[PDB]
Amino acid sequence: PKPILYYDERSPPVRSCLMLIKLLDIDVELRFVNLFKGEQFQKDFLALNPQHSVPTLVHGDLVLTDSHAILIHLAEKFDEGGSLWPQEHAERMKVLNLLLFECSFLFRRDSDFMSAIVRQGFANVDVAHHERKLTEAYIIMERYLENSDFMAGPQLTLADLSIVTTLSTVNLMFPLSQFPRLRRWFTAMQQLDAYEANCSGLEKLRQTMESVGSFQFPSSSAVVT
Amino acid sequence: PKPILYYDERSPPVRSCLMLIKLLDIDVELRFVNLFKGEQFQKDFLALNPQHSVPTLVHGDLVLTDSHAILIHLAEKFDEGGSLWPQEHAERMKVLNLLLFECSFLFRRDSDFMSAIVRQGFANVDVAHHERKLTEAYIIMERYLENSDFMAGPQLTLADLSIVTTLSTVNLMFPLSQFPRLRRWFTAMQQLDAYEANCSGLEKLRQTMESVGSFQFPS
Ligand SMILES: C[C@]12CC[C@@H]3c4ccc(O)cc4CC[C@H]3[C@@H]1CC[C@@H]2O
Ligand SMILES: C[C@]12CC[C@@H]3c4ccc(O)cc4CC[C@H]3[C@@H]1CC[C@@H]2O
């Protein structure tokens, strides 16, 4: 049976999977789970994924509950032998390493900030604290791109798909003026046809956050091309 | 080209690597980085790993900066044909899925709690809040164990190595009395020869935390 993706496109790791699905032309059934309405706590979804998170993939009997496993699984099954999840061991470990940076560092910090806004309202968030935490992530990505054209080496990999969605989300709030390699790379990602899959959920996330958090992102921060 | 592991055994993900190294008899050069003195911010280590994190593995030209990548790399290089990192795709994805649960959920929540102690001091941490978050992780793992002896299936895998160290660290503070499957799994893990590599750093973490957090674990 074809893969089933439980999704809310406002989430950047969901959008990373949508980008890969578009890039490889994978036929997938989409099932919406509204994270802001709490539909991830519905009894049936909880039984399927006790972490109450999207993206969740059901592909036959395999149930994957983390975007990075979903990206690797889909690459192995639909980009067999390809370069998104490279064949050579060291290149593949480099991609894996950056997927884990996205999980453990970039997304961890973006989620900390966004959840603070939802729970507290923007006016009651220590924005400076989160600006420091997220600028630190910018600095690290800039260091990676000083030595490499894409995040994990000379060509597009799963690492770029995973990182660009969260980066575009962080950059709704924090400008990239001081980060020329990151700007160049983000601009290049924005030219990819697959990036069209990031645009709609990024904008829906912007709308939802401004309403739920009672604020406006600074329009000047987002890199637009 | 022998691997170099930058480490501080108080960190649970470091201990997961130490356990794999012992399990697989891997010859590694250890380099101590003292996280509680901020040696992870020294210019040369920061140039090597801008995330200023341990474990960091240098294996020739490859620089790995996340325990889960290190576990997979070492299994692939030193345990081809083993059950720790299964060859069969669905089995391997299942292990990978639980490794990411450890990274994204169990360790995130344990790090949030421990970070809040070191920063705010134990007396000022909202312990009930962290107890709710970390007990939720216990509940999930109890369900993962419903129809398997180990986290990812019938056999020991990298997922068990990654989870046991953080679990043993959470369990300094929160008991497993209420989780029969988790308590039995944890007790089985402690009977493995490789589990000896977890003991020293867990006790050093307790000592360091109780001193820096000015409290004592109920353990
Ligand atoms: C705020 C939540 C946690 C953080 C989530 C997040 C975190 C980061 C991000 O870039 C987008 C989102 C959208 C959904 C958010 C969730 C909606 C309910 C849940 O509380
Ligand atoms: C407290 C730090 C973050 C949380 C870290 C942690 C987080 C979880 C855990 O089980 C152990 C440790 C040991 C080192 C800790 C670090 C030493 C300084 C840093 O701030």
PDB file of C-alpha atoms in Angstrom, chain B:
ATOM      1  CA  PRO B   1      43.059   5.755  11.662  1.00  0.00           C
ATOM      2  CA  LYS B   2      41.755   5.033  15.178  1.00  0.00           C
ATOM      3  CA  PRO B   3      38.579   6.927  16.179  1.00  0.00           C
ATOM      4  CA  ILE B   4      38.893   9.743  18.708  1.00  0.00           C
ATOM      5  CA  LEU B   5      35.984  10.276  21.100  1.00  0.00           C
ATOM      6  CA  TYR B   6      35.683  13.632  22.881  1.00  0.00           C
ATOM      7  CA  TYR B   7      33.667  12.814  25.971  1.00  0.00           C
ATOM      8  CA  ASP B   8      32.388  13.645  29.442  1.00  0.00           C
ATOM      9  CA  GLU B   9      30.987  10.475  31.006  1.00  0.00           C
ATOM     10  CA  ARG B  10      28.406  12.454  32.994  1.00  0.00           C
ATOM     11  CA  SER B  11      26.428  12.970  29.758  1.00  0.00           C
ATOM     12  CA  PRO B  12      24.045  10.038  29.034  1.00  0.00           C
ATOM     13  CA  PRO B  13      24.602  10.115  25.248  1.00  0.00           C
ATOM     14  CA  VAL B  14      28.326   9.893  25.915  1.00  0.00           C
ATOM     15  CA  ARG B  15      27.622   6.832  28.045  1.00  0.00           C
ATOM     16  CA  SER B  16      25.618   5.292  25.183  1.00  0.00           C
ATOM     17  CA  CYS B  17      28.734   5.505  22.992  1.00  0.00           C
ATOM     18  CA  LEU B  18      30.937   4.128  25.754  1.00  0.00           C
ATOM     19  CA  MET B  19      28.564   1.158  26.051  1.00  0.00           C
ATOM     20  CA  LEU B  20      28.735   0.422  22.316  1.00  0.00           C
ATOM     21  CA  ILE B  21      32.523   0.735  22.354  1.00  0.00           C
ATOM     22  CA  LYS B  22      32.700  -1.815  25.161  1.00  0.00           C
ATOM     23  CA  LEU B  23      30.126  -4.095  23.532  1.00  0.00           C
ATOM     24  CA  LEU B  24      32.063  -4.149  20.247  1.00  0.00           C
ATOM     25  CA  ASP B  25      35.640  -4.044  21.663  1.00  0.00           C
ATOM     26  CA  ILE B  26      36.336  -0.910  19.613  1.00  0.00           C
ATOM     27  CA  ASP B  27      39.804   0.590  20.066  1.00  0.00           C
ATOM     28  CA  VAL B  28      39.166   4.332  20.534  1.00  0.00           C
ATOM     29  CA  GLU B  29      41.246   7.222  21.844  1.00  0.00           C
ATOM     30  CA  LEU B  30      39.330   9.029  24.605  1.00  0.00           C
ATOM     31  CA  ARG B  31      39.730  12.779  25.110  1.00  0.00           C
ATOM     32  CA  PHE B  32      38.058  14.299  28.167  1.00  0.00           C
ATOM     33  CA  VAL B  33      36.153  17.572  27.738  1.00  0.00           C
ATOM     34  CA  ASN B  34      34.850  18.957  31.032  1.00  0.00           C
ATOM     35  CA  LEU B  35      31.332  20.216  30.313  1.00  0.00           C
ATOM     36  CA  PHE B  36      30.850  21.702  33.784  1.00  0.00           C
ATOM     37  CA  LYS B  37      33.947  23.865  33.312  1.00  0.00           C
ATOM     38  CA  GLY B  38      32.920  24.917  29.810  1.00  0.00           C
ATOM     39  CA  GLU B  39      35.850  23.267  28.032  1.00  0.00           C
ATOM     40  CA  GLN B  40      33.402  22.641  25.179  1.00  0.00           C
ATOM     41  CA  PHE B  41      33.715  26.378  24.392  1.00  0.00           C
ATOM     42  CA  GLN B  42      37.511  26.351  24.022  1.00  0.00           C
ATOM     43  CA  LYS B  43      38.391  27.814  20.629  1.00  0.00           C
ATOM     44  CA  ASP B  44      39.846  24.611  19.181  1.00  0.00           C
ATOM     45  CA  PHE B  45      36.993  22.341  20.246  1.00  0.00           C
ATOM     46  CA  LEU B  46      34.459  24.954  19.098  1.00  0.00           C
ATOM     47  CA  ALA B  47      36.218  25.083  15.739  1.00  0.00           C
ATOM     48  CA  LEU B  48      35.889  21.290  15.571  1.00  0.00           C
ATOM     49  CA  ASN B  49      32.246  21.261  16.738  1.00  0.00           C
ATOM     50  CA  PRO B  50      30.319  24.576  16.703  1.00  0.00           C
ATOM     51  CA  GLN B  51      27.514  22.854  18.630  1.00  0.00           C
ATOM     52  CA  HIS B  52      29.972  22.598  21.577  1.00  0.00           C
ATOM     53  CA  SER B  53      28.602  19.152  22.430  1.00  0.00           C
ATOM     54  CA  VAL B  54      29.876  15.747  23.490  1.00  0.00           C
ATOM     55  CA  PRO B  55      30.078  13.041  22.400  1.00  0.00           C
ATOM     56  CA  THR B  56      32.070  14.174  19.355  1.00  0.00           C
ATOM     57  CA  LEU B  57      33.790  11.528  17.250  1.00  0.00           C
ATOM     58  CA  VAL B  58      36.704  12.231  14.915  1.00  0.00           C
ATOM     59  CA  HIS B  59      37.327   9.238  12.663  1.00  0.00           C
ATOM     60  CA  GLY B  60      39.807  10.249  10.012  1.00  0.00           C
ATOM     61  CA  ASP B  61      38.208  13.167   8.193  1.00  0.00           C
ATOM     62  CA  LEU B  62      34.711  12.376   9.524  1.00  0.00           C
ATOM     63  CA  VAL B  63      33.560  14.581  12.426  1.00  0.00           C
ATOM     64  CA  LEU B  64      30.348  13.408  14.092  1.00  0.00           C
ATOM     65  CA  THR B  65      28.622  15.658  16.604  1.00  0.00           C
ATOM     66  CA  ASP B  66      25.601  13.654  17.745  1.00  0.00           C
ATOM     67  CA  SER B  67      25.548  10.432  19.746  1.00  0.00           C
ATOM     68  CA  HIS B  68      22.982   8.840  17.442  1.00  0.00           C
ATOM     69  CA  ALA B  69      25.179   9.351  14.378  1.00  0.00           C
ATOM     70  CA  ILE B  70      28.140   8.006  16.339  1.00  0.00           C
ATOM     71  CA  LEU B  71      26.258   4.850  17.358  1.00  0.00           C
ATOM     72  CA  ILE B  72      25.169   4.184  13.775  1.00  0.00           C
ATOM     73  CA  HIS B  73      28.608   4.942  12.336  1.00  0.00           C
ATOM     74  CA  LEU B  74      30.372   2.672  14.822  1.00  0.00           C
ATOM     75  CA  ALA B  75      27.847  -0.137  14.307  1.00  0.00           C
ATOM     76  CA  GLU B  76      28.237   0.116  10.523  1.00  0.00           C
ATOM     77  CA  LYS B  77      32.041   0.185  10.642  1.00  0.00           C
ATOM     78  CA  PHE B  78      32.677  -2.298  13.457  1.00  0.00           C
ATOM     79  CA  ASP B  79      29.599  -4.555  13.558  1.00  0.00           C
ATOM     80  CA  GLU B  80      28.716  -5.363   9.960  1.00  0.00           C
ATOM     81  CA  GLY B  81      26.322  -8.308  10.197  1.00  0.00           C
ATOM     82  CA  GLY B  82      25.306  -7.575  13.790  1.00  0.00           C
ATOM     83  CA  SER B  83      21.850  -7.306  15.265  1.00  0.00           C
ATOM     84  CA  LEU B  84      22.457  -3.888  16.861  1.00  0.00           C
ATOM     85  CA  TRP B  85      21.859  -2.019  13.597  1.00  0.00           C
ATOM     86  CA  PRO B  86      19.744  -4.490  11.600  1.00  0.00           C
ATOM     87  CA  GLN B  87      20.356  -5.102   7.909  1.00  0.00           C
ATOM     88  CA  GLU B  88      16.650  -5.547   7.138  1.00  0.00           C
ATOM     89  CA  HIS B  89      15.146  -2.207   6.170  1.00  0.00           C
ATOM     90  CA  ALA B  90      11.948  -2.241   8.237  1.00  0.00           C
ATOM     91  CA  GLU B  91      13.856  -3.428  11.298  1.00  0.00           C
ATOM     92  CA  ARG B  92      16.516  -0.747  10.810  1.00  0.00           C
ATOM     93  CA  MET B  93      13.896   1.996  10.388  1.00  0.00           C
ATOM     94  CA  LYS B  94      12.295   0.870  13.626  1.00  0.00           C
ATOM     95  CA  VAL B  95      15.624   1.254  15.465  1.00  0.00           C
ATOM     96  CA  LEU B  96      16.176   4.623  13.800  1.00  0.00           C
ATOM     97  CA  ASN B  97      12.690   5.759  14.826  1.00  0.00           C
ATOM     98  CA  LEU B  98      13.431   4.952  18.477  1.00  0.00           C
ATOM     99  CA  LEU B  99      16.866   6.620  18.339  1.00  0.00           C
ATOM    100  CA  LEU B 100      15.081   9.786  17.242  1.00  0.00           C
ATOM    101  CA  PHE B 101      12.509   9.375  20.036  1.00  0.00           C
ATOM    102  CA  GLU B 102      15.465   9.352  22.400  1.00  0.00           C
ATOM    103  CA  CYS B 103      16.932  12.473  20.803  1.00  0.00           C
ATOM    104  CA  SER B 104      13.704  14.433  20.310  1.00  0.00           C
ATOM    105  CA  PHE B 105      11.608  13.424  23.337  1.00  0.00           C
ATOM    106  CA  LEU B 106      13.335  11.520  26.155  1.00  0.00           C
ATOM    107  CA  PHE B 107      16.655  13.388  26.087  1.00  0.00           C
ATOM    108  CA  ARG B 108      15.055  16.730  25.222  1.00  0.00           C
ATOM    109  CA  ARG B 109      12.936  16.467  28.367  1.00  0.00           C
ATOM    110  CA  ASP B 110      15.743  15.220  30.574  1.00  0.00           C
ATOM    111  CA  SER B 111      18.025  17.997  29.281  1.00  0.00           C
ATOM    112  CA  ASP B 112      15.311  20.598  29.908  1.00  0.00           C
ATOM    113  CA  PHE B 113      15.034  19.450  33.526  1.00  0.00           C
ATOM    114  CA  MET B 114      18.773  19.141  34.201  1.00  0.00           C
ATOM    115  CA  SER B 115      19.458  22.453  32.459  1.00  0.00           C
ATOM    116  CA  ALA B 116      16.847  24.159  34.664  1.00  0.00           C
ATOM    117  CA  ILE B 117      18.530  22.789  37.800  1.00  0.00           C
ATOM    118  CA  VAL B 118      22.057  23.869  36.883  1.00  0.00           C
ATOM    119  CA  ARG B 119      20.724  27.302  35.880  1.00  0.00           C
ATOM    120  CA  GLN B 120      17.997  28.100  38.435  1.00  0.00           C
ATOM    121  CA  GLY B 121      19.116  25.856  41.287  1.00  0.00           C
ATOM    122  CA  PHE B 122      17.045  22.871  42.368  1.00  0.00           C
ATOM    123  CA  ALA B 123      15.084  24.842  44.969  1.00  0.00           C
ATOM    124  CA  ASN B 124      13.571  27.015  42.239  1.00  0.00           C
ATOM    125  CA  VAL B 125      12.804  24.443  39.550  1.00  0.00           C
ATOM    126  CA  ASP B 126       9.163  23.582  38.834  1.00  0.00           C
ATOM    127  CA  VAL B 127       9.733  19.919  39.651  1.00  0.00           C
ATOM    128  CA  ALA B 128       6.095  18.909  39.179  1.00  0.00           C
ATOM    129  CA  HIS B 129       6.164  20.257  35.614  1.00  0.00           C
ATOM    130  CA  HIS B 130       9.281  18.245  34.755  1.00  0.00           C
ATOM    131  CA  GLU B 131       7.865  15.205  36.543  1.00  0.00           C
ATOM    132  CA  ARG B 132       4.796  15.365  34.289  1.00  0.00           C
ATOM    133  CA  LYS B 133       6.920  15.707  31.136  1.00  0.00           C
ATOM    134  CA  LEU B 134       9.328  12.908  32.062  1.00  0.00           C
ATOM    135  CA  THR B 135       6.606  10.560  33.302  1.00  0.00           C
ATOM    136  CA  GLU B 136       4.935  10.984  29.929  1.00  0.00           C
ATOM    137  CA  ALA B 137       8.144   9.613  28.405  1.00  0.00           C
ATOM    138  CA  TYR B 138       8.034   6.643  30.789  1.00  0.00           C
ATOM    139  CA  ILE B 139       4.457   5.973  29.686  1.00  0.00           C
ATOM    140  CA  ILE B 140       5.472   5.952  26.010  1.00  0.00           C
ATOM    141  CA  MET B 141       8.363   3.546  26.589  1.00  0.00           C
ATOM    142  CA  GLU B 142       6.116   1.225  28.589  1.00  0.00           C
ATOM    143  CA  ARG B 143       3.894   1.033  25.498  1.00  0.00           C
ATOM    144  CA  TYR B 144       6.872   0.499  23.172  1.00  0.00           C
ATOM    145  CA  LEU B 145       7.701  -2.572  25.253  1.00  0.00           C
ATOM    146  CA  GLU B 146       4.240  -4.146  25.069  1.00  0.00           C
ATOM    147  CA  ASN B 147       5.115  -6.868  22.574  1.00  0.00           C
ATOM    148  CA  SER B 148       8.921  -6.955  22.575  1.00  0.00           C
ATOM    149  CA  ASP B 149      11.695  -7.719  25.064  1.00  0.00           C
ATOM    150  CA  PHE B 150      13.656  -4.669  23.859  1.00  0.00           C
ATOM    151  CA  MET B 151      12.765  -1.178  22.694  1.00  0.00           C
ATOM    152  CA  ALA B 152      12.900  -1.951  18.955  1.00  0.00           C
ATOM    153  CA  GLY B 153      11.962  -5.641  18.871  1.00  0.00           C
ATOM    154  CA  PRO B 154      13.022  -9.054  20.193  1.00  0.00           C
ATOM    155  CA  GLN B 155      16.779  -8.286  20.172  1.00  0.00           C
ATOM    156  CA  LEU B 156      19.076  -5.667  21.656  1.00  0.00           C
ATOM    157  CA  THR B 157      19.705  -2.767  19.264  1.00  0.00           C
ATOM    158  CA  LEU B 158      21.298   0.675  19.272  1.00  0.00           C
ATOM    159  CA  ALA B 159      17.949   2.037  20.450  1.00  0.00           C
ATOM    160  CA  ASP B 160      18.384   0.237  23.775  1.00  0.00           C
ATOM    161  CA  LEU B 161      21.909   1.611  24.232  1.00  0.00           C
ATOM    162  CA  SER B 162      20.770   5.171  23.552  1.00  0.00           C
ATOM    163  CA  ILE B 163      17.674   5.012  25.765  1.00  0.00           C
ATOM    164  CA  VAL B 164      19.091   3.136  28.776  1.00  0.00           C
ATOM    165  CA  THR B 165      21.647   5.812  29.659  1.00  0.00           C
ATOM    166  CA  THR B 166      19.184   8.690  29.600  1.00  0.00           C
ATOM    167  CA  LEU B 167      16.596   6.529  31.388  1.00  0.00           C
ATOM    168  CA  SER B 168      19.095   5.629  34.131  1.00  0.00           C
ATOM    169  CA  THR B 169      19.704   9.381  34.465  1.00  0.00           C
ATOM    170  CA  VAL B 170      16.036  10.334  34.617  1.00  0.00           C
ATOM    171  CA  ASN B 171      15.621   7.465  37.133  1.00  0.00           C
ATOM    172  CA  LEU B 172      18.041   9.126  39.528  1.00  0.00           C
ATOM    173  CA  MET B 173      15.082  11.432  40.201  1.00  0.00           C
ATOM    174  CA  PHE B 174      11.917   9.510  39.131  1.00  0.00           C
ATOM    175  CA  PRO B 175      11.351   5.834  40.037  1.00  0.00           C
ATOM    176  CA  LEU B 176      10.146   3.050  37.729  1.00  0.00           C
ATOM    177  CA  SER B 177       7.918   1.377  40.338  1.00  0.00           C
ATOM    178  CA  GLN B 178       4.788   2.023  38.270  1.00  0.00           C
ATOM    179  CA  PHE B 179       6.110   0.745  34.932  1.00  0.00           C
ATOM    180  CA  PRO B 180       6.463  -3.040  35.053  1.00  0.00           C
ATOM    181  CA  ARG B 181       7.720  -3.469  31.485  1.00  0.00           C
ATOM    182  CA  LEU B 182      10.195  -0.583  31.792  1.00  0.00           C
ATOM    183  CA  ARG B 183      11.476  -1.758  35.177  1.00  0.00           C
ATOM    184  CA  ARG B 184      12.053  -5.291  33.881  1.00  0.00           C
ATOM    185  CA  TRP B 185      13.722  -4.011  30.711  1.00  0.00           C
ATOM    186  CA  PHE B 186      15.992  -1.734  32.754  1.00  0.00           C
ATOM    187  CA  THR B 187      16.928  -4.613  35.030  1.00  0.00           C
ATOM    188  CA  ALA B 188      17.738  -6.826  32.040  1.00  0.00           C
ATOM    189  CA  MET B 189      19.929  -4.060  30.582  1.00  0.00           C
ATOM    190  CA  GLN B 190      21.900  -3.838  33.835  1.00  0.00           C
ATOM    191  CA  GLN B 191      22.812  -7.528  33.481  1.00  0.00           C
ATOM    192  CA  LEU B 192      24.726  -6.915  30.231  1.00  0.00           C
ATOM    193  CA  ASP B 193      28.510  -6.845  30.437  1.00  0.00           C
ATOM    194  CA  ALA B 194      28.505  -3.697  28.309  1.00  0.00           C
ATOM    195  CA  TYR B 195      26.287  -1.948  30.870  1.00  0.00           C
ATOM    196  CA  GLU B 196      29.322  -1.580  33.149  1.00  0.00           C
ATOM    197  CA  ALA B 197      30.333   1.407  31.000  1.00  0.00           C
ATOM    198  CA  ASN B 198      27.276   3.370  32.251  1.00  0.00           C
ATOM    199  CA  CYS B 199      27.915   3.100  35.983  1.00  0.00           C
ATOM    200  CA  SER B 200      30.866   5.444  36.520  1.00  0.00           C
ATOM    201  CA  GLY B 201      29.460   8.464  34.674  1.00  0.00           C
ATOM    202  CA  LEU B 202      25.981   8.140  36.136  1.00  0.00           C
ATOM    203  CA  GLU B 203      27.441   8.345  39.648  1.00  0.00           C
ATOM    204  CA  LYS B 204      29.710  11.247  38.681  1.00  0.00           C
ATOM    205  CA  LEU B 205      26.678  13.055  37.266  1.00  0.00           C
ATOM    206  CA  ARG B 206      24.782  12.559  40.508  1.00  0.00           C
ATOM    207  CA  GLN B 207      27.722  13.880  42.546  1.00  0.00           C
ATOM    208  CA  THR B 208      28.224  16.875  40.247  1.00  0.00           C
ATOM    209  CA  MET B 209      24.504  17.690  40.023  1.00  0.00           C
ATOM    210  CA  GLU B 210      23.828  17.392  43.755  1.00  0.00           C
ATOM    211  CA  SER B 211      26.751  19.741  44.400  1.00  0.00           C
ATOM    212  CA  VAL B 212      25.900  22.192  41.612  1.00  0.00           C
ATOM    213  CA  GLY B 213      22.153  21.872  42.255  1.00  0.00           C
ATOM    214  CA  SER B 214      22.508  21.916  46.060  1.00  0.00           C
ATOM    215  CA  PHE B 215      20.129  19.046  46.652  1.00  0.00           C
ATOM    216  CA  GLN B 216      20.061  15.271  46.785  1.00  0.00           C
ATOM    217  CA  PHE B 217      18.328  12.810  44.506  1.00  0.00           C
ATOM    218  CA  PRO B 218      15.840  10.542  46.327  1.00  0.00           C
ATOM    219  CA  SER B 219      17.993   7.752  44.853  1.00  0.00           C
TER     220      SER B 219
END
